[PDB]
């Protein structure tokens, strides 16, 4: 199987986030390889002067969306949606605009900048 690019729900996306090691993290320009399912991410990354190579052994790209899309699967961050062609997609829904990447404590939800140095 070879990954393909899709442009559905493009107008509902504010930005993109990266998932590494099962935990979402911010994206830096120095990263060189990703797994991508979107075509607008090329314009998102090129405007910042970055280039990358597509491979399955690299962190996935997920789009921050303002619309409730997909369904929740236990153990997986965000939501999962499957395209009409069988390809799966990942999104980060939110309730309020001031949301980055949120992790779960046993009692409350707190945002974080780095998983290794947070109460996550």
């Amino acid at each position: 199987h070879v990954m393909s690019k899709h442009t559905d729900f493009s107008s509902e996306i504010i930005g993109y986030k990266a998932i590494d090691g099962g935990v979402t993290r911010d994206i830096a320009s120095t990263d060189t390889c990703f797994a991508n399912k979107h075509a607008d991410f090329d314009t998102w990354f090129s405007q910042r002067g970055g280039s990358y190579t597509n491979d399955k052994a690299c962190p996935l790209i997920a789009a921050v969306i303002t619309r409730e899309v997909g369904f929740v699967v236990p153990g997986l961050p965000g939501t999962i949606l499957r395209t009409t062609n069988g390809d799966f997609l990942h999104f980060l829904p939110r309730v309020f605009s001031a949301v980055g990447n949120i992790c779960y404590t046993p009692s409350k939800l707190i945002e974080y900048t780095d998983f290794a140095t947070s109460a996550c």
């Binding site: 199987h1 099962g22 052994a57 996935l60 069988g86």
Partner: protein, 87 residues
């Protein structure tokens, strides 16, 4: 004795390969064929993994070869690590 069982296994594998080739011909030219039911059911199903849908059955997995699945991502795993102990 063992040779008969080996030949039976080879023939079963050849039949499975023939079914896979029929599925490939279906994906190329249509097609109403043997593997239609499994893929049609799996596309509309909410099972993101093939293990829960096919329940480990060989023909169901063979018919589903070539489609995207959640199991294909190795980056989603998280190996448990024990930190350094002391000085």
């Amino acid at each position: 004795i063992i040779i008969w069982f080996l030949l039976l296994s080879v023939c079963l594998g050849s039949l499975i390969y023939s079914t896979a080739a029929l599925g490939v011909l279906m994906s190329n030219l249509g097609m109403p064929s043997y593997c239609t039911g499994y893929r049609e059911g799996y596309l509309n199903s909410t099972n993101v993994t093939i293990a829960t849908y096919c329940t480990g059955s060989i023909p169901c997995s063979v018919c589903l070869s070539g489609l995207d699945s959640l199991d294909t991502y190795p980056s989603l795993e998280t190996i448990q690590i024990t930190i350094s102990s002391f000085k």
